């Protein structure tokens, strides 16, 4: 269902987590999503033939 | 077979007529027929599309 498409990446997690008994809320890691929009493009070409006899 | 059409109406009589002993030929009435001619007319409209891809 061809539409302008939007592919997304997620960056690498690059935080220190938690050590030992510390719970996750002391260092939550941030998921980051980057995006791009790809709009379609129509293009074509045609060939016209001669008369059937030829 | 939709040809040009021609309807007709019969007009209503007027005119004095004859009185007494006067004979009919002294005032003949006119049986008047009126007609109209309706000629057909062709008319139409159109919508063109963009490329199938669009």
* Number of distinct helices of chain A: 0
| Total strands of chain A | 2
What is the distance, rounded to the nearest whole angstrom, between the alpha carbons of the first and last residues of chain A? 41 Å
- Largest pleated sheet of chain A: 2 strands, antiparallel
| Greatest interface | A-B, 4 and 3 residues
Helix fraction of chain A? under 10%
Order of helices and strands of chain A: EE
What is the quaternary state of this protein?
part of a larger assembly
Task: Work out the radius of gyration of chain A.
Answer: 27 Å
Strand order of the largest sheet of chain A: 1-2
* Secondary-structure class of chain A: little secondary structure
In percent, how much strand structure appears in the residues of chain A?
A: 5-15%
Shape of chain A: rod-shaped
Protein name (chains A, B): Major structural protein ORF14
Task: Label this structure with key terms.
part of a larger assembly; 2 chains; 54 residues; little secondary structure; 0% helix; rod-shaped; Major structural protein ORF14 (chains A, B)
